[PDB]
Amino acid sequence: KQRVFIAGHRGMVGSAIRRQLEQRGDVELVLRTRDELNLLDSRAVHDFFASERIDQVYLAAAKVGGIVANNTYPADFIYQNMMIESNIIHAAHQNDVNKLLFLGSSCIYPKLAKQPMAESELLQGTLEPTNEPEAIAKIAGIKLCESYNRQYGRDYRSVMPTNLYGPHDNFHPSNSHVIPALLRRFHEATAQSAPDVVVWGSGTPMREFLHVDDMAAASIHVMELAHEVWLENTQPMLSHINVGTGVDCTIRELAQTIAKVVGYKGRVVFDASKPDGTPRKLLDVTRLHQLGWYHEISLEAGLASTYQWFLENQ
Amino acid sequence: KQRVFIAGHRGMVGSAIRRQLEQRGDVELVLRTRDELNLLDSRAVHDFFASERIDQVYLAAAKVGGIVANNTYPADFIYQNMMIESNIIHAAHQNDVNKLLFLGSSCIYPKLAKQPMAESELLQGTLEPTNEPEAIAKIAGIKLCESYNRQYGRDYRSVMPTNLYGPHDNFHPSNSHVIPALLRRFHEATAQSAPDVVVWGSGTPMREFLHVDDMAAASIHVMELAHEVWLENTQPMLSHINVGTGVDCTIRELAQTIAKVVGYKGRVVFDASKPDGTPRKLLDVTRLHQLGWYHEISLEAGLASTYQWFLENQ
Ligand SMILES: NC(=O)c1ccc[n+]([C@@H]2O[C@H](COP(=O)([O-])OP(=O)(O)OC[C@H]3O[C@@H](n4cnc5c(N)ncnc54)[C@H](OP(=O)(O)O)[C@@H]3O)[C@@H](O)[C@H]2O)c1
Numbered sequence: 025k026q027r028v029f030i031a032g033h034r035g036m037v038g039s040a041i042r043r044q045l046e047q048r049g050d051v052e053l054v055l056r057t058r059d060e061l062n063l064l065d066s067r068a069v070h071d072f073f074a075s076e077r078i079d080q081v082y083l084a085a086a087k088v089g090g091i092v093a094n095n096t097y098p099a100d101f102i103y104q105n106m107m108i109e110s111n112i113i114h115a116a117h118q119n120d121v122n123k124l125l126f127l128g129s130s131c132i133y134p135k136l137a138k139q140p141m142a143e144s145e146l147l148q149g150t151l152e153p154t155n156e157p158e159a160i161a162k163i164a165g166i167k168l169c170e171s172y173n174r175q176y177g178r179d180y181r182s183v184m185p186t187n188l189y190g191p192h193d194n195f196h197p198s199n200s201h202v203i204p205a206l207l208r209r210f211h212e213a214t215a216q217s218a219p220d221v222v223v224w225g226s227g228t229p230m231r232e233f234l235h236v237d238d239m240a241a242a243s244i245h246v247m248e249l250a251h252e253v254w255l256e257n258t259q260p261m262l263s264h265i266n267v268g269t270g271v272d273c274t275i276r277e278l279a280q281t282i283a284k285v286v287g288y289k290g291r292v293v294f295d296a297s298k299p300d301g302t303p304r305k306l307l308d309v310t311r312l313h314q315l316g317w318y319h320e321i322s323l324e325a326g327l328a329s330t331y332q333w334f335l336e337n338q
Numbered sequence: 339k340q341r342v343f344i345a346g347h348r349g350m351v352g353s354a355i356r357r358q359l360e361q362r363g364d365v366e367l368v369l370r371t372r373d374e375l376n377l378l379d380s381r382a383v384h385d386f387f388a389s390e391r392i393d394q395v396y397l398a399a400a401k402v403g404g405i406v407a408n409n410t411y412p413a414d415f416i417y418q419n420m421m422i423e424s425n426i427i428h429a430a431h432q433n434d435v436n437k438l439l440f441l442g443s444s445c446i447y448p449k450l451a452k453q454p455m456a457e458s459e460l461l462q463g464t465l466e467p468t469n470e471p472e473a474i475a476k477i478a479g480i481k482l483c484e485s486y487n488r489q490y491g492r493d494y495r496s497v498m499p500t501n502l503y504g505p506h507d508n509f510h511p512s513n514s515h516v517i518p519a520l521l522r523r524f525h526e527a528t529a530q531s532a533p534d535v536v537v538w539g540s541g542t543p544m545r546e547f548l549h550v551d552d553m554a555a556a557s558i559h560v561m562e563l564a565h566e567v568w569l570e571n572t573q574p575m576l577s578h579i580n581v582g583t584g585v586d587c588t589i590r591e592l593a594q595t596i597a598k599v600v601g602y603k604g605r606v607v608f609d610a611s612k613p614d615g616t617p618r619k620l621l622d623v624t625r626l627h628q629l630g631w632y633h634e635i636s637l638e639a640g641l642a643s644t645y646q647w648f649l650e651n652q
């Protein structure tokens with residue numbers, strides 16, 4: 025069995041990967057909570073790698089937040105993510121861990137990228153300011169992996185998810201992430217019998233959403249590809265793989281779907297006196313599809329199962 | 339007196355800053371060699387800051403090299419520079435050091451940047467591959483400074499030098515840095531009585547060169563500006579300041595000048611069957627000039643004094 029360390033296993037993404045692997049008789053999971061191992065502490069991280077015989081690492085630990093958190097604590101987001109990534113990568117290398125999967129984010133891409141965004145859009149223009157600090161730390165993570173691959177012949181791969189939703193999300197109505205926010209807002213609206221729910225903007229912008237269990241399955245799929253196959257479909261200094269659906273959805277279609285899924289009978293209302301973001305943002309997932317992975321969970325199905333998970337965990 | 343820690347003080351840039359400050363009765367220098375303090379060791383760096391009452395830091399320590407070194411050891415260049423920067427910045431903050439000057443490099447800029455390159459070119463396109471790893475670590479350094487400035491109201495400023503030359507450079511004929519390389523090549527050619535020296539390319543590309551003592555004076559100048567003045571001439575998320583001459587020189591003019599400076603009487607020869615780089619690369623130094631600093635050392639004068647330093651230190 026392969027000994028697989030999923031950093032950040034109690035996280036949204038980490039716990040999705042754990043649920044899938046825990047069904048694998050060919051895998052032994054090695055897991056440490058934050059209390060047991062602070063991944064900011066280089067010495068602790070090296071001690072763990074030196075004593076635990078790891079074969080593969082899924083790097084799913086990170087300082088994460090929404091718009092307010094990213095603009096309010098920028099130092100926390102660049103420092104902590106640079107240090108977690110640096111410590112784990114360095115320790116992995118030092119202890120002969122050859123396989124690693126780094127989980128980044130689509131925030132890496134330029135604000136005005138060409139759509140849909142191919143992996144080659146990386147570094148082609150200015151970042152969104154709200155996410156700039158975290159985005160630079162995640163690009164540094166990808167370039168750490170690439171650099172160790174190139175200097176030492178490592179196999180440290182990377183995926184960049186689109187917007188994710190599903191179990192273990194933060195279902196507060198003030199989350200800036202639209203799916204959990206709206207699930208919770210429509211849930212409460214449905215409880216109060218509120219006549220309407222008002223969403224800022226016209227509803228016209230197009231966005232992309234992937235269920236976290238699809239993310240986890242794609243991530244495992246990418247981790248487990250033959251190296252020769254992964255190499256044929258990437259480039260040493262352009263090595264990351266976008267993970268998503270590659271399909272747009274309007275915020276209007278999303279909000280009307282969530283209303284249906286929760287059984288809301290009032291009105292979804294869009295207040296177009298508020299600004300819209302860009303008209304379209306989504307990943308080009310041609311590389312992942314060429315590597316033989318396609319998502320399985322439709323928005324409708326994913327929303328319904330996610331909402332059921334929230335009901336069970338209120 | 340202000341207690342000033344110059345990280346990397348025995349380096350080319352660090353030692354230039356030290357020579358200038360050591361003439362300041364208002365400054366007490368705090369210096370630690372690599373052997374005394376390994377800046378990769380977070381615990382050691384924090385212990386130093388916690389016991390040494392520092393007021394200002396000049397961050398002039400880095401893993402540095404030429405074209406071969408950067409392409410051969412990419413992991414070393416991204417990892418080491420990320421960790422030195424992260425450790426010093428974090429420790430400074432933690433111990434109430436309010437003033438810091440981070441020394442980056444013009445390698446940060448896109449390969450196809452608009453010339454001359456204004457600070458706003460940062461992040462506008464693809465990096466030169468040879469330097470990509472180091473460049474991402476230095477951009478992460480600038481964004482660490484910005485992030486601490488914005489979250490905690492720190493005063494962590496940054497300068498990006500152009501190509502530098504002067505005392506304490508590496509004067510081996512195989513240095514990929516053209517000034518020390520050519521000084522040493524013409525020096526040897528002059529000793530051997532070699533009939534010619536052949537330089538690859540046509541000589542037409544334009545490049546920018548600044549003497550290291552000018553860099554040091556500009557760096558001190560930028561460190562010491564009133565915060566209100568520095569703020570008026572920068573932007574929180576676009577805070578770095580280019581340091582250079584803002585003036586182009588052909589590689590042909592450079593090589594013919596070096597030949598004159600060393601007293602070579604053979605021929606400078608350009609072999610145009612080898613490729614040239616881009617036609618022009620230089621910094622726009624309007625922000626530094628607006629902040630009231632202008633370089634003092636002409637290329638001719640700088641070359642002559644640099645060569646005299648090499649003669650004295652062979
Ligand atoms: N929609 C999404 O969820 C989404 C979208 C795009 C990309 N991603 C990428 O996926 C990665 C994981 O996202 P996520 O939402 O799954 O995060 P989470 O799931 O909210 O948290 C991941 C976790 O890693 C842990 N961690 C952070 N710092 C640690 C430390 N110093 N020591 C040990 N553990 C530490 C956290 O610990 P403590 O939580 O207990 O604080 C947290 O449990 C992120 O890098 C994110 O950018 C996620």
Ligand SMILES: NC(=O)c1ccc[n+]([C@@H]2O[C@H](COP(=O)([O-])OP(=O)(O)OC[C@H]3O[C@@H](n4cnc5c(N)ncnc54)[C@H](OP(=O)(O)O)[C@@H]3O)[C@@H](O)[C@H]2O)c1
Pocket residue numbers: 345346347348349350351352371372375376377378398399400401402422441442443444499500501502503
């Ligand atoms: N032409 C130029 O020189 C030039 C141009 C553009 C930008 N810059 C920027 O200026 C900065 C300094 O450049 P430079 O040429 O002055 O470098 P140097 O002068 O060649 O070396 C700087 C030094 O900092 C030290 N250092 C590195 N790692 C350390 C560690 N782990 N612990 C303690 N000290 C450490 C080095 O120690 P050990 O040397 O003894 O290994 C070295 O003495 C760099 O970031 C460079 O990118 C320089």
